């Protein structure tokens, strides 16, 4: 897997993207690694905020399925043709693999300004595939055809680049222990949250709050997204834990940046945020922890910062805000997500994430999903 180390480019705003070679002769695209969807969907015509797209007419091995795909979502929508073609992953594999491909000809809040990717690699389960779960996924193609385990792992380093290890775990990407939490439902990478704690203090919410409709692990969502009730409670604990004159309301909702003398950094006065996850043994949990530096994110004479947590509707999305702290292990063969502390997850010689365990789950229900 050393061939797969540092194969990702980007940061949490560009996205983390992988160089993918499609068709014959090969056309090089930059593809967003997206654990929150299940289609290989690429740019099929030219379009604003992209330089390249995949031209299906210039590939002699391309084959059209003769139908279209349509995904409406809340932000917007995407529409493409569905086909098949040969792909390689040069930082990874020698050989080429025959896969399904959606070529996007029309969209809305899809290709948002300042992205460097011109497609999406959906690495979630068949169940999310569109138009239906019978459209074999890229990873299910690659497991079968490349003879790799049914596992991949991801490290983001933009807190530059990162690593997508298809096939396994690379030991030089983590130190300390992997802790694994069960995947509750194979669609998204849906996992069970038992508790959020801010500055040592747990929020006083029914653990059900953190899992209606779902808590997921999604490389394809920038921020830590929290159901409005949860968000509001995280914001209130963060500001009470802070003791220093308040942030603006505009800060907390994405509409304002807070700024300091390029010198007096804001990290010393903000609390830790810890998300507790159920271990494989249900009596036990483990906690993944982000310091201020991952959720109070930098964007001449002043350094400015955005809040790295936003509200959602039906989902607690563990996005890039959190995954930027951890080597995250998508062990589909064992129906579990693993987390270890990322060594690259360090700023000014301090670790910006922590993992520890084990703790008692004798205070929370036997199941926190509704």
């Amino acid at each position, epitope marked *: 897997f050393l061939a797969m180390v540092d194969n990702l480019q980007g940061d949490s705003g560009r996205g983390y993207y992988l160089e993918m070679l499609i068709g014959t002769p090969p056309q090089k695209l930059q593809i967003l690694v997206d654990t929150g969807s299940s289609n290989f969907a690429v740019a099929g015509t030219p379009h604003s905020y992209i330089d390249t797209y995949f031209d299906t007419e210039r590939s002699s091995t391309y084959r059209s*399925k003769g139908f279209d795909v349509t995904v409406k979502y809340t932000q917007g929508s995407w529409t493409g043709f569905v086909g098949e073609d040969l792909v390689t992953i040069p930082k990874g594999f020698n050989t080429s693999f025959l*896969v399904n491909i959606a070529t996007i000809f029309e969209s809305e809040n899809f290709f948002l300004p300042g992205i460097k990717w011109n497609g999406i690699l959906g690495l979630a389960y068949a169940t999310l595939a569109k138009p239906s779960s*019978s459209l074999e996924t890229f990873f299910d193609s690659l497991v*079968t055809q*490349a003879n790799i385990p049914n596992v991949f792992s991801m490290q983001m380093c933009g807190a530059n680049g990162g690593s997508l290890v298809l096939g396994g775990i690379e030991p030089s990407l983590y130190k300390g222990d992997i802790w694994y939490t069960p995947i509750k439902e194979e669609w998204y990478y849906q996992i069970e949250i038992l508790k959020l704690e801010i500055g040592g203090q747990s929020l006083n919410l029914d653990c059900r709050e953190y899992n209606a409709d779902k808590a997921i692990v999604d490389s394809g969502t920038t921020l830590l997204r929290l159901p409005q009730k949860v968000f509001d409670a995280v914001v209130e604990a963060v500001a009470r834990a802070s003791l220093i004159p308040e942030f603006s309301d505009g800060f907390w909702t994405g509409s304002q940046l807070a700024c300091w003398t390029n010198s007096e950094t804001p990290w010393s006065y903000f609390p830790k945020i810890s998300i507790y996850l159920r271990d494989e043994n249900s009596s036990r949990s483990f906690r993944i922890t982000i310091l201020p530096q991952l959720y109070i994110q930098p964007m001449l004479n002043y350094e400015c910062y955005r809040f790295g947590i936003s509200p959602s509707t039906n989902a607690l999305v563990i996005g890039a805000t959190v995954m930027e702290g951890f080597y995250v292990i998508f062990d589909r063969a064992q129906k579990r997500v693993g987390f270890a502390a990322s060594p690259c997850a360090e700023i000014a010689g301090a670790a910006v994430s922590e993992i520890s365990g084990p703790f008692s789950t004798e205070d929370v229900a036997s199941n926190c999903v509704p």
Partner: nanobody
Amino acid sequence: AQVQLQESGGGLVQPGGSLRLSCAASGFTFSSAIMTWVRQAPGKGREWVSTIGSDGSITTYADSVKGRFTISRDNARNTLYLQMNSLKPEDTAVYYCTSAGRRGPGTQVTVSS
């Protein structure tokens, strides 16, 4: 989309022998699915054999069976095939068909001297 799959046609052959495997599909639009043949012998690693794209024109093979095996399909009959000549004892295994995540039960191929 209940992708149901059922392979047939394995058996016990000699070196230099031949077989032809089939795989019947139901549950899904066979005519629009990429179809793959994989093999598993006991005590070994899973090994890809061959893939075919949905309209049949696109076919790839593992170096270990290139020019000995041929994959084909019949869309009108929702059936996948694999013709296997020049059989070697290393070809021994359970051969199965996989699509979208799902597989049939497999069919046994034994090349015993």
